[PDB]
């Protein structure tokens, strides 16, 4: 965006928001969290027993499922549990950190309906260097100045700690929490194991097995290329199961993309081919195709998890420095104003920092406004209704031709 370039350029301004960017993205990136969120949706819908699996990949009741397939269930459950944890414990924090940026920015610069805190600080400095002002009024202005800065320092520290807490939550998402949460790293390990096993046993049984499973892998590769290529999301984030269980959820908006429409047609073709195929081909390609895509997904969850850790360590440092600079403002700078009887330079710095804060506050608001909202295993992952809309409204599950 134009605004992202403005934010870097501004990132040098004292009392301002600093470099709240991440490459060509806002430091809280709409596109990043939208993409991640797609993988999580897929996770939230994973099946954990035979009947669920059949319903999910859309396999005829008349088809037998070999026993080694059962390994799927435990790891799918863990993956699902992970997704649910993320949905409850991680993603809402991201929304909150965006809100913290909007809140601070509108507080110091003022809400567009307005005086923000920086204008109030400026006027206080006016009173401190006014010669008409008697000594009592000076002393009072100084106390008010320090108090108001103290509130900004407290909030900045709160936001700093919130960013630290996001980093901690990410480390738990990836490495587990030493309790009932298995980490993405271990989930990835087991998913790769099961993938190897099932591929050896049921993924190379015939030429058509290899052909079709390779076709699905190619579609996932292209889909992923397209996803990583599209930088700018213009719509409120929603998700779609249009591509079905072979590929997983995608951000709804990306359905417009020509390449993705091509992929939808190739998927419709696969469905036609499988639904009337020899039973073992039908079964193996649905189940293992989906599993291969889940492995690609979990790889993406891992790497983008590590990336996000780096981003929120950066944000953490930004709030630390914001608080440090306001502490300097209320002590050393304020004393200099008193000694020099000159406040104009500080006042103009506060004006300029106000404008920079407006820029990042608008980006934070935009993020929030457009973000997505919404061995037994039968008790750890009970059946829920999560996929039912998708089973009732996605083409993959249309069986009129059966």
Residue numbers in the entry: 12 to 125, 128 to 387, 445 to 472
Task: Show me the paper's own sentences about this structure.
The Cry6 family of proteins from Bacillus thuringiensis represents a group of powerful toxins with great potential for use in the control of coleopteran insects and of nematode parasites of importance to agriculture. One such Cry protein is Cry6Aa, a protein with activity against Coleoptera such as the Western Corn Rootworm Diabrotica virgifera virgifera and a range of nematodes, including both free-living (Caenorhabditis elegans and Panagrellus redivivus) and plant pathogenic (Heterodera glycines and Meloidogyne incognita) species that cause large-scale losses to agriculture. To increase our understanding of their mode of action and to facilitate further development of these proteins we have determined the structure of Cry6Aa in protoxin and trypsin-activated forms and demonstrated a pore-forming mechanism of action. The structures obtained are novel among invertebrate-active toxins and are consistent with Cry6Aa acting as a pore-forming toxin.
This helix bundle is around 20–25 Å in diameter with a head domain folded across the helices at one end, formed from residues close to the C-terminus of the protein. The deconvoluted intact average molecular weight (MWavg) value of 46,844.19 Da matches the theoretical value (46,843.43 Da) expected for a core protein containing polypeptide chain 12–390 disulfide bonded to chain 444–475 with a mass error of +16.2 ppm. These results show trypsin cleavage after Arg390 and processing sites after Arg443 and, at a lower frequency, after Lys450. The solved structure of the trypsin-activated Cry6Aa corresponds to the major core of the toxin with the longer CTP1 fragment (from Asn444 to Trp472) still linked to the main body of the toxin by a disulfide bond. This bond can be clearly resolved in the structure (insert).
